[PDB]
Amino acid sequence: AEKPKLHYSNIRGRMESIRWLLAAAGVEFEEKFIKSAEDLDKLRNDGYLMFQQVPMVEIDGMKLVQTRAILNYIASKYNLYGKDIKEKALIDMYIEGIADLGEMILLLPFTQPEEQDAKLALIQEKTKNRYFPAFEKVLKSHGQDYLVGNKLSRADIHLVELLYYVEELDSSLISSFPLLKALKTRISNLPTVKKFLQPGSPRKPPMDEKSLEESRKIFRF
Amino acid sequence: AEKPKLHYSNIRGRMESIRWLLAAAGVEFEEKFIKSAEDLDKLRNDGYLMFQQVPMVEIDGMKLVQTRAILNYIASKYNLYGKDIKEKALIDMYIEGIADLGEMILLLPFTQPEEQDAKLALIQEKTKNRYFPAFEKVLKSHGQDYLVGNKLSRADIHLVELLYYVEELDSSLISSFPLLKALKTRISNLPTVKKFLQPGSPRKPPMDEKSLEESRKIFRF
């Protein structure tokens, strides 16, 4: 038909969780890579960015900005946001938990090199001492395979995405957390998620020196 | 039903947008004020707080934490989150912009004395040239009295709530936005809002030296 169109640079950044979520719902999409500050300026000058920033997603006849606005729409549309307002409330509480950790991780590669040790240390402590216990507690409490309502929701996808990033930063962090380890395998084995994990998918690589410099120019810092 | 129960200290912080939104929907609520570090850790130890943080609200048999999850639940329950998925996307996009500036203002009194003049200046520039233009544009484009679907939603409440704080910080910032000026008066004259704006309501004051030191000891900074 008309595929969702993703407006971002060729990095993870704030678009990566939208990619995951779209792939987990079986949704094929297109990416229009911003390659320069001039490209970003175009979308601004045209009036397509309500707050002058990307991510912007063209979907279902709307140009959506703001990551949470985009992710909420996809999750509602593709039934990954709970069956009722009470499940939705548990989903929202958990994913906001996930985003707390998610944001520290996203910001890490853009931090000054004379800060990166302490920031990762802060991710280490929060992850082991607080956030991983919270999610393990949830799974232990119901003994079910999904976070909410005994059914795949966005929270499983958001948490597993995050597990792959935690995995890369410090592989020991998940070690004392068995149900988290098992959630990760089971979700990785879902057909849609299995496909996105394959080489050549729109799953993006971690930041490196070259993209960091690309980003400096595009986003002007 | 029960009265919803709000756990927080007697300050605005992250609970204040939840008080506004409950008041606007005409919901009576109870506040159990945290007055020490000990009241807060008791909450933690009793397992009331998923991520060991407030705001927390007891509502409909849940101990909901994370400001966005509480807000989304209340808004959906009281029909303030739009009529359908597409009106929800518009609302989500709007409120996240409103929260981007909202966050600047919320964090402001907690910044170091020597940062505060630059922090304010950034709030003034972003207000004048990015956020107020954005919502003045919305109103001009549809010609209606409300931001979304010609009907009161949470976006009206959160924005007007925000216009009150911008007035505290700099009364001139709104002077060039006649449609924003008019929205505030309409919304403020609404009977739930008018009541919550009266003396002795649950509405909270600006931070002062004393609530700042209270917060240092409760939240520990």
Ligand SMILES: C[C@]12CCC(=O)C=C1CC[C@@H]1[C@@H]2CC[C@]2(C)C(=O)CC[C@@H]12
């Ligand atoms: C604002 C910011 C954080 C504070 C800082 O120190 C430097 C930057 C500049 C790059 C921003 C980043 C935040 C996250 C952004 C938006 C992305 O996901 C792509 C580029 C990146």
Ligand SMILES: C[C@]12CCC(=O)C=C1CC[C@@H]1[C@@H]2CC[C@]2(C)C(=O)CC[C@@H]12
């Ligand atoms: C983290 C923080 C900002 C960064 C900073 O400079 C100092 C603090 C300490 C208190 C936090 C605040 C964020 C907003 C919080 C959660 C409230 O609404 C009440 C207490 C307060």
